[PDB]
């Protein structure tokens, strides 16, 4: 009852060996395997498109039938490595194969990863939300029987199981050195928050990582995993066995369409001087006034340029803004507009995401009693924006945690015996209404809310917006509010209001989002004239500090540099200009001097 030989498996193995046997051709894969041997790794990365070119039928077989074809490919790879080098092949029991390249339809996202892909190779792209501790897993256990002087072996693989006694009840003692254990980890992948409609429910796919793939992923990392999607033993829980995991750049690029790029270029070249002013005016048309606040929010959206030095320093290019003001002001409305406009922004409150809070957390699953490092809102906001409401109501533990992310942009957690240092570089836009309302211009903003004044130091811009009872200002605000409320759509007959739906100069909000997303890619650089001007302006600000907001210091200098870079991005200029520096300087003057 044992398969003597298989023709299909032999054919597949020989074909894969021929493919890897790249010597009569460019030799790309032979060089790859040689470099693999030299590097001591044991996972070859294979471009599926090359296999399709060499043999479309073989690639189709591999994609449609994953387990058997990959087993044959691994066999062929091990044979080829042995042929090139026998001792190295003997060093490692098995050599794995990792796929790569374009996948016609198997390239999906967790939302679109339907059950029809079971047993098919898939290329799932998403955001890592939960990770498990690296744990050894026995794949082959060797036992010894002194009574019978007999060594037995057992394989578990995909298949009280742990043998302990001989068939005659003679004790068996394990041979730990001979047995085979491989490191094993489990993670979860979800669709990118930006491109994930709210109507649908969350779609999370589990991923299993083994060997070198174990630690090549962390929570809050946008990763593409190519693997085999299989059903666990029995309703059938489904998991994806990872063949290769690659972290894709979080910045990515605005693919959009050539028409959108042309429109953006035309808009930029139309009036570069006033482009920032027009965007600020159109940022939140429903809100009247607060012009400088809108400009600062736009600067935050565009963000500065992160500088990394040879000494490992990571001077942050993000811009953090805090809004303090009496209730019944557009703070929350401004945050909503930022969410609707920012290319990649995530909302949150002082409490933060339930359980995980704002930053990452360690949670016992409580379904199997297993620890999991779950990413928080701040971590998922990496290289994006986090809009915090009721920032004052943040918990004390979160009050301490936010410090590390604000300072260095990375959150470190060692509690529960779990070590992790997750990237959390994210511009933060927080709004906190003063305690007991009715902000008093006597106490410090710290004493008005309570922040320890260290967070106030961390935030680049702190805008105090008070509900002054000026009849002229009140008339302007009331006129704007009533004009907005009376506004009727271009097509309507003064009839019914918008029907209840089951689905959730001035530039369009979507167009503004696209434009800022395109602009964010630019990497403007300083100019000597701009450097001298900013130095002179900083000296002037220090001088004005003589009279007795927070004092002007080097933090203000870096804030000015970041604002100048952001406004340079607004115009798409590859080099900052005196206009950008002047705009940043006047904005800072307004922020620190009403």
């Amino acid at each position: 009852t044992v398969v003597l030989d298989d023709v299909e498996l032999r054919e597949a193995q020989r074909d894969y060996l021929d493919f890897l046997d790249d010597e009569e051709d460019q030799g790309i894969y032979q060089s790859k395997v040689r470099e693999l041997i030299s590097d001591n790794q044991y996972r070859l990365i294979v471009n599926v498109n090359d296999l399709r070119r060499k043999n479309e039928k073989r690639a189709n077989r591999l994609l449609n039938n994953a387990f058997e074809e990959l087993v044959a490919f691994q066999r062929a790879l091990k044979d080829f490595v042995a042929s090139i080098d026998a001792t190295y092949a003997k060093q490692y029991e098995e050599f794995y194969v990792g796929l790569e390249g374009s996948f016609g339809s198997k390239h999906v996202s967790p939302r679109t990863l339907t059950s029809c892909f079971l047993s098919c190779v898939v290329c799932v792209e998403g955001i890592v939300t939960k990770c498990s501790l690296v744990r050894p897993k026995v794949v082959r256990s060797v036992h010894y029987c002194p009574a019978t002087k007999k060594t037995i072996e057992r394989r578990y693989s995909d298949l009280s199981v742990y043998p302990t006694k001989d068939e005659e009840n003679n004790p068996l003692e394990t041979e730990y050195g001979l047995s085979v254990y491989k490191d094993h980890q489990t993670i979860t992948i979800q669709e990118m928050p930006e491109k994930a409609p709210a109507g649908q429910l969350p779609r999370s796919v589990d991923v299993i990582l083994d060997d070198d793939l174990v630690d090549k992923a962390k929570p809050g990392d946008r990763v593409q995993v190519v693997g085999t999607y299989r059903c666990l033993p029995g309703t059938f829980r489904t998991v994806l066995i990872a063949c290769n995991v690659k972290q894709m750049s979080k910045d990515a690029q605005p693919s959009f369409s050539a028409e959108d790029i042309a429109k953006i270029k035309k808009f930029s070249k139309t009036r570069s001087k006033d482009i920032f002013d027009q965007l600020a005016k159109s940022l939140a048309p429903s809100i009247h006034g607060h012009d400088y606040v809108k400009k600062a929010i736009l600067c935050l959206l565009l963000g500065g340029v992160e500088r990394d030095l040879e000494n490992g320093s990571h001077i942050r290019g993000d811009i953090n803004i805090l809004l303090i003001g009496d209730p019944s002001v557009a703070k929350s409305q401004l945050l909503r507009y930022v969410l609707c406009t920012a290319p990649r922004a995530i909302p949150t409150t002082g409490r933060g995401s339930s359980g995980v809070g704002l930053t990452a957390a360690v949670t016992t699953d409580q379904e199997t009693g297993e620890r999991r490092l779950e990413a928080g809102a701040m971590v998922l906001a990496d290289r994006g924006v986090v809009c915090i409401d009721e920032f004052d109501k943040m918990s004390d533990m979160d009050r301490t945690a936010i410090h590390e992310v604000m300072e260095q942009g990375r959150v470190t957690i060692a509690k529960a015996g779990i070590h992790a240092r997750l990237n959390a570089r994210c511009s933060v836009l927080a709004a906190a209404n003063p305690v007991y309302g009715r902000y008093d211009q006597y106490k410090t903003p710290m004493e008005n809310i309570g922040l320890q004044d260290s967070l106030l130091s961390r935030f680049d811009l702190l805008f105090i917006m008070l509900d002054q009872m000026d009849p002229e200002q009140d008339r302007e605000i009331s006129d704007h509010v009533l004009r907005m409320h009376r506004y009727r759509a271009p097509g309507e007959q003064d009839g019914d209001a918008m029907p209840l739906g089951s689905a959730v100069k001035m530039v369009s909000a979507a167009f503004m989002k696209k434009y800022i997303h395109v602009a964010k890619i630019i990497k403007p650089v300083l100019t000597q004239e701009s450097a001298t001007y900013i130095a002179e302006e900083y000296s002037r600000l220090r001088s004005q500090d003589s009279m007795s907001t927070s004092p002007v210091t080097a933090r203000t200098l870096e804030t000015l540099i970041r604002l100048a870079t952001a406004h340079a991005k607004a115009r798409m200029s590859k080099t900052v200009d005196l206009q950008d520096a002047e705009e940043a300087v006047e904005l800072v003057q307004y922020a620190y001097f009403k």
């Binding site: 449609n64 387990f67 969350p202 033993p233 309703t235 990413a375 003064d494």
Partner: protein, 587 residues
């Protein structure tokens, strides 16, 4: 009367059917749809039962009488037609994929109550509103088992679709068998809870709930709170096998009713008539009846030029006494409202007022259930003991009344449930929520006719502020600010009340007299608010006294019960003392 003959009939219907005319051509609607879908990643179609009946009424009769078997035949026919239409598939794609046939009908819906067991295994079409949804899991349809001892294998064991169990053979080692997931074929799977529409609920009756099963692409198309109509096979494990879902993405009356409503609007005292005519059975009401009327009619859910929307609903709070008859008033108003849900802050429901995600142990799987707010979307939510909400409910209600949406979060992804419900809350004595209540008060026409008029006006007329009325309100707002307090949010609340008042009369615009009436109601609320600042004061004087507490505590130090008692004896409210203590802890 042969399965093959029926499958041939379905195949010819799908591929040979013609739509249009000589002018527009006799297009093969289903053929083109299948081709387009297969060229894409859809692998499904929409079947018009009207189209099938027009083509061959006998086929529709078969589907109604025997839906499952003829549905399978129709699916196989769809597979064949898709194969022939797309015979030259590219390399790799040549493997043919199954097609899920989804069916729709123009036939009038059927009340969930009118569902006899005789229709079991008979196609039905019922409307409703979903209340809970289940995480999309994977369920096996084709399975294979192996004999652990004999090694015998039984491949492609068809599993009938539905919420059924399995069938393990008795032996070839006895019953024990091992399922081999490698070759097992599975499809998505999703259980939902559908509730009878609040319009059709019998008086004093709990709407009935049914379980719906959606497996293929038809699953994951709906979220709790949606108003939907489902065509499916009535099944009993008691549940429904879903075959087609229609979601009321937009919108959803005899001429005599319209004439009566026009007459009522034309009445000069229509405002007074409605105010007096709502609850004649209760005593001790003066302009609270008018406020409840304005709440029922509600304001206009506007869409600002930027594309955002401003809550058109009006929230009313009744602060005061347990002895008062606000329980009876809430019951009456929820009965009158076209869509009305009445609960308390301690309703004890698993979902609560807002939605909630819970792992059901019965399946150990996440189920998202919609709370009272979401169910009453577009209606009214009466909340007794609103001050006794849960912690999660207290967190949610802020956004629930702010954006009229309930936002649940899973890591990064966030699901949003539409809750455009006007809230009528009752309480005796968190405080931040009080700022978001549009109106706060301290303690003839038949009910059905009132409900019909309310629904008619709400669905037909949405008023707007006239230039004269808006200018009058603007000047009045400036005066109120100068005298002072009033906030811009209060201006928006006044605007919504004025719009509701104008809607009562079914006027496209709002007259300055309507603004004056809205201002009268808001001035009642605001002088009541002055005496509520006396009641609550949570305020220059309050700030000053809090500063006094701060100074006193600094002087004292820089048991807990004794300290609290002393400060309370010093005229300091307990809430103020607790707030000062919390603030100093934060510092």
């Amino acid at each position: 009367a042969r399965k093959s003959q029926l499958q041939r009939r379905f195949k010819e219907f799908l591929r040979q059917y013609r739509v249009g005319t000589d002018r527009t051509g006799f297009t093969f609607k289903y053929r083109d749809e299948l081709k387009r879908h297969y060229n894409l990643g859809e692998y499904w179609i929409e079947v018009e039962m009207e189209d099938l009946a027009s083509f061959d009424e006998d086929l529709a009769d078969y589907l109604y009488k025997q839906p499952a078997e003829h549905l399978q035949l129709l699916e196989e026919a769809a597979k064949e037609v898709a194969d022939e239409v797309t015979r030259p598939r590219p390399s790799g794609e040549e493997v043919l994929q199954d097609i899920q046939v989804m069916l729709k009908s123009d036939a009038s819906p059927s009340s969930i109550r009118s569902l006899k067991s005789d229709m079991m295994s008979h196609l039905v079409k019922i409307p409703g509103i979903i209340i809970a949804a289940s995480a999309v899991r994977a369920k096996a349809t084709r399975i294979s088992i192996q004999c652990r001892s004999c090694r015998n294998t039984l491949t492609n064991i068809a599993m009938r679709p539905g919420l059924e169990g399995y069938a393990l053979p008795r032996k070839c080692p006895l019953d024990p068998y091992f399922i081999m997931p490698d070759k097992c074929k599975c499809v998505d799977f999703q259980t939902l809870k559908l509730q009878e529409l609040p319009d059709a609920v019998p008086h004093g009756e709990m709407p009935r709930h049914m379980q719906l099963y959606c497996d293929r692409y038809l699953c994951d198309k709906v979220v709790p709170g949606n108003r939907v109509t489902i065509m499916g096979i009535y099944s009993i494990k008691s549940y429904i096998r879903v075959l087609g879902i229609q979601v009321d993405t937009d919108g959803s009356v005899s001429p005599q009713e319209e004439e009566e409503f026009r007459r009522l609007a034309a009445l000069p005292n229509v405002y007074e008539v409605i105010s007096k005519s709502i609850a004649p059975s209760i005593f001790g009401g003066t302009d609270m009846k008018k406020a409840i009327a304005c709440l029922l009619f509600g304001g206009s859910r506007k869409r600002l030029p930027d594309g955002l929307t401003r809550r058109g609903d009006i929230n009313l709070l009744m602060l005061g006494d347990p002895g008062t008859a606000k329980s009876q008033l809430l019951k009456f108003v929820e009965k009158c409202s076209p869509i009305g849900v009445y609960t308390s802050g301690k309703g004890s429901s698993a979902a609560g007022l807002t939605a909630s995600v819970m792992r059901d142990p019965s399946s150990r799987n996440f189920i998202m259930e919609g709370g009272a707010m979401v169910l009453a979307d577009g209606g009214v939510v009466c909340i007794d003991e609103f001050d006794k909400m849960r912690e999660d409910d207290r967190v949610a209600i802020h956004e629930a009344m702010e954006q009229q949406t309930i936002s649940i979060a899973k890591a990064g992804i966030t699901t949003t449930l539409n809750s455009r419900c006007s809230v009528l809350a009752a309480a005796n004595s968190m405080p931040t929520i009080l700022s978001r209540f549009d109106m706060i008060f301290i303690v003839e026409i038949d009910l059905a006719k009132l409900k019909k008029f309310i629904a008619y006006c709400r669905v037909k007329c949405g008023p707007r502020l006239s230039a004269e009325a808006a200018e009058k309100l603007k000047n009045r707002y400036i005066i109120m600010r100068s005298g002072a307090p009033i906030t811009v949010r209060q201006l928006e609340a006044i605007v919504r009340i004025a719009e509701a008042l104008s809607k009562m009369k079914l006027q496209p615009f709002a007259t300055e007299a309507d603004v004056e009436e809205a201002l009268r109601l808001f001035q009642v609320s605001t002088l009541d608010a002055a005496l509520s600042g006396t009641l609550s004061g949570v305020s220059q004087e309050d700030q000053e006294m809090l500063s006094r507490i701060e100074k006193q505590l600094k002087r004292r130090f820089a048991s807990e019960h004794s300290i609290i008692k002393d400060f309370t004896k010093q005229k300091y409210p307990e809430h103020a003392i607790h707030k000062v203590l919390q603030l100093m802890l934060r510092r």
